Ligand SMILES: O=C(O)c1cc(-n2cc(CO)nn2)cc(C(=O)O)n1
Ligand SMILES: O=C(O)c1cc(-n2cc(CO)nn2)cc(C(=O)O)n1
Ligand SMILES: O=C(O)c1cc(-n2cc(CO)nn2)cc(C(=O)O)n1
């Protein structure tokens with residue numbers, strides 16, 4: 163499957179793509195404002211994620227640091243990124259269909275649209291100014307808006323036992339972005355697409 167990753171932000175981002183125990187395609191790349199990077203994701207990829215990283219430095223070997231979304235200091239991510247990270251999430255070719263969503267469960271750093279480029283389903287978007295409106299206690303000094311689990315480490319915010327409800331913090335993310343997951347047990351906003359669809363992830367779709 164092809165994923166065209168487009169940076170419409172006015173700032174550089176370092177795109178990342180991983181399924182947690184391996185890179186997808188090269189795993190990461192710099193995208194200056196306006197640049198597009200198309201990756202190939204293997205059919206059947208389960209639990210894949212794409213995100214933006216901000217304020218990164220990498221040496222000539224591809225090792226360094228990012229202020230949001232750092233994946234073990236690598237340009238080419240093999241693992242998932244450090245919150246806060248707005249997440250484009252997908253599982254492909256699962257009994258004949260693809261499944262996509264956006265999640266704020268690991269916080270929000272950069273606005274995003276995640277849409278099919280082929281027929282048969284809608285896209286999803288979380289493009290509100292979550293960082294600007296972020297509750298004081300969730301603001302990440304390194305940049306972005308943390309989820310409450312990251313900040314407070316409670317069973318209720320982290321849904322540790324599989325039982326939890328919405329919270330004042332989850333409701334903030336849900337108010338700003340109704341079409342993204344705001345906590346682990348949120349009413350799902352997953353979209354079912356035809357198996358083997360192709361996609362575009364756009365950072366700052368309205369900004
Ligand atoms: O065991 C680990 O340290 C570990 C494992 C995974 N895994 C993620 C997946 C797939 O969802 N499998 N291991 C991710 C990370 C990380 O992002 O730091 N770390
Ligand atoms: O760099 C890692 O391998 C790593 C870093 C973190 N950390 C993330 C943060 C910030 O929220 N602090 N450590 C968690 C994990 C894991 O759970 O596997 N793994
Ligand atoms: O503590 C962790 O979360 C962690 C630790 C290691 N470590 C591996 C080694 C061996 O040299 N030491 N920490 C790898 C990872 C990961 O790849 O996600 N994660």
Ligand SMILES: [Eu+3]
Pocket residue numbers: 241
């Ligand atoms: Eu780890």
